[PDB]
Amino acid sequence: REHWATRLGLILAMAGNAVGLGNFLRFPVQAAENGGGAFMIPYIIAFLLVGIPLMWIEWAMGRYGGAQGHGTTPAIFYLLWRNRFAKILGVFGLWIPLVVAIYYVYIESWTLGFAIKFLVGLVPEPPTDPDSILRPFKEFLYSYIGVPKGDEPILKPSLFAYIVFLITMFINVSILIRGISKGIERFAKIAMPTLFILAVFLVIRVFLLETPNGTAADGLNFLWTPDFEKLKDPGVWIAAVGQIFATLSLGFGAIITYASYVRKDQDIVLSGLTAATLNEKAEVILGGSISIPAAVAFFGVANAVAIAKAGAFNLGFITLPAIFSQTAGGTFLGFLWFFLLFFAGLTSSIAIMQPMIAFLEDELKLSRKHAVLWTAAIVFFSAHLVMFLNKSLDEMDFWAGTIGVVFFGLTELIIFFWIFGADKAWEEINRGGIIKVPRIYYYVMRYITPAFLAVLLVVWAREYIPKIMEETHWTVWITRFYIIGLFLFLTFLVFLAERRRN
């Protein structure tokens, strides 16, 4: 099996995995929509009672299965629990990362294209009216991704957007094709430091933004000012948990696959903890100090929140660059923003393709080159669905990026810490650890986490099962059909691997 060269390389690769578009796009929005400071408390609790324990669990499973030449859940679930249904449940560990890769890589390509255009200086040129400043950029984005006037099902992506997508795929391939240590690690060791430096620079530059309408400091206060009136809103807790799952790459099967390349004896406790901590620093400190503080700086708190509620991409791709345009060298600033976003995305996309690649290598005994090329072909092909169909990306993000990750988290936690055995699991997690997990977390993993997740899934199910059947648009049915087909396909592959074993 292939392994990580250095412990630092490992840490930075995992950090790259976690630290992505979720930190600089999703988080600011989620925090603003949920009352800023009010959102933090749950966010923290969820981080302590869900993020950390699941992180350690996925590291443990990853290393465990990896020691036996398996980096994916279809095989690992079987090693932990002898049963066909364990493999079937294991299929989600490829389905989820595949589905998410599909649209994630596309958004990443967006950030790339924007970075390019902003570097070259091909951007809309605003003239004191907010709408006359945001409109040009709304038209810019809509032209780029091909959004229809009304609510029409067909998207018409510009040629440049398509080409940029192809390029992005090429880059992902060029990195993934060099393996774990020579590919992912060597790139992480650069992309990560670069990312942090850019993030810091932007945080400062933004902190220097002050107008008659507000200041960035106002935004910081808003985000870090507690509010206990929202603690009775389940939606805030659900949002927090969702954010934790998303940002920590939990339930995606990526952490496990990366962990499978960690030597059986090496520590996963301190390493994992460090990666998670890095991600949180990048999120609450860097990610939360750019977009929101700037929006608040220009339009004030209320309008900032309104824009946040307007959409996820509305803030990162429209509002922020429009704000930048009103400053000296704001175009270059935009370029830095989108470049940061690009590295952040890439270092995560490679992580979500590595599970599929790893399955092809381990279970179908394919070479690295072939595995990477085929994974790239499948993702690229399927990506047309997201590119040309309106509301497809949202549906995928929902079924895989929202429900699927939670369901899968509960599944892996139950299999590892209940069926496989809580004591054996604990010993497996702590073994080789440079530091040891506080005993309390044992009780957190065995009772608290699974209970909370179960409740969450119950609520979600109750709220969504009726809405599901009554859906008007056909694009969502086409998408559902398709991803279901992908599930059947992956199942078939798992079957072939199983038969090859015999």
Near ligand MET by CB under 6 A, which window of 16-24, 132-140, 411-419, 458-466? Answer: 16-24
Number of H-type helices and E-type strands within the chain: 26, 2
Q: Measured in whole angstroms, how far is the alpha carbon of residue 501 from the centre of its chain?
A: 33
Sketch the per residue contact string, 22 through 61, with ligand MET: x for CB under 6 A, - otherwise.
xx--------------------------------------
Q: Is 191 in the site for Na ion (CB under 5 A)?
A: no
Question: Shortest distance, CB of residue 242 to ligand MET, whole angstroms?
Answer: 11
- Shortest Cβ 76–Na ion spacing (Å): 23
Site string for ligand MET, 332-371 (x = CB under 6 A): ----------------x--xx-------------------
Residue 21 interface partner, choices Na ion, ligand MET, none, CB cut-off 5-8 Å depending on type: ligand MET
Report in angstroms how near the CB of residue 437 gets to Na ion at its nearest. 22
CB within 8 Å of 334: residues ≥ 6 apart: 114, 118, 123, 320, 321, 324, 325
Phi/psi at 409 (5° precision): -60, -50
Is there binding between residue 318 and ligand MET (CB under 6 A)? Answer: no
The bridge status of strand 214-215 relative to strand 210-211 is: antiparallel
Picked from ligand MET, Na ion, none, the partner binding residue 42 (CB below 5 to 8 A depending on kind) is: none
Minimum separation from the CB atom of position 458 to ligand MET (A): 24
Residue 406 as a binder of ligand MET (CB under 6 A): the answer is no
444 backbone φψ class: left, alpha, beta (φ>0; ψ -120 to 50): alpha
Q: Going by C-beta distance under 8 Å and a sequence separation of 6 or more, which residues neighbour residue 45?
A: 240
Give the residue with the Cβ less far from ligand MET, 144 or 245.
245
Options 20, 113, 355, 404; binder of ligand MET; rule CB under 6 A: 20
Q: For ligand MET, which is the closer residue by CB, 247 or 449? A: 247
Question: Is 84 annotated as ligand-binding?
Answer: yes
Q: Which does residue 246 bind out of ligand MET, Na ion, none, counting CB within 5 to 8 angstroms by kind?
A: ligand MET
CA distances 204 to 46, 198, 289, 453, Å, are: 29, 10, 9, 38
Tell whether residue 20 is a contact of Na ion (CB under 5 A): yes
CA–CA dist 33, 29 (Å, integer): 6
Encoded one letter per residue, x for contact with Na ion by CB under 5 A and - for no contact, window 276-295 reads ---x----------------
* C-alpha dihedral, 331 to 336 to 340 to 341, nearest 10°: 0
Question: SS3 breakdown of the chain: % helix, strand, coil, rounded to 5?
Answer: 80, 0, 20
Contact 180, 189 (CB under 8 A): no
Contact flags string 233-252 toward ligand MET, x per CB under 6 A: -------------xx-x--x
SS3 471: coil
For ligand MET, give the closer residue by CB, 240 or 297.
Answer: 240
- Closer of 20 and 293 to ligand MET (Cβ): 20
* 288 is a contact residue toward ligand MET (CB under 6 A): no
Element (H, E) at 210: strand 210-211
Q: Give, as ranges, the residues between 239 and 258 that touch Na ion (CB under 5 A).
A: 247
Structure tokens of 263? 């030597």
Is the Cβ of residue 99 or residue 278 nearer to Na ion in the bound state?
278
Name which of Na ion, ligand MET, none residue 252 binds, using a CB cut-off of 5 to 8 Å depending on partner kind. ligand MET
Q: Cβ 448 to ligand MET, closest distance in Å?
A: 23
168 touches Na ion (CB under 5 A):
no
348-377 residues in contact with Na ion (CB under 5 A) are: 348
Q: How far apart are CA 156 and CA 261, in angstroms?
A: 41
Helix (H, G, I), strand (E, B) or coil at 215: strand
- Residue 33 belongs to what H/E stretch? helix 27-33
Q: CA 206, 208, 213, 216 torsion: positive or negative?
A: positive
Closer residue to ligand MET in complex, CB, 246/429? 246
331 binds ligand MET, rule: CB under 6 A: no
Phi, psi of 214 (to 5 degrees): 165, -170
How many residues line the site for ligand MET (CB under 6 A)? 14
The one-character DSSP state at 81 is S
Binding-site annotation: residue ranges for phosphocholine: 84
Site of interaction with ligand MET (CB under 6 A) = 17-18, 20-23, 246-247, 249, 252, 254, 348, 351-352
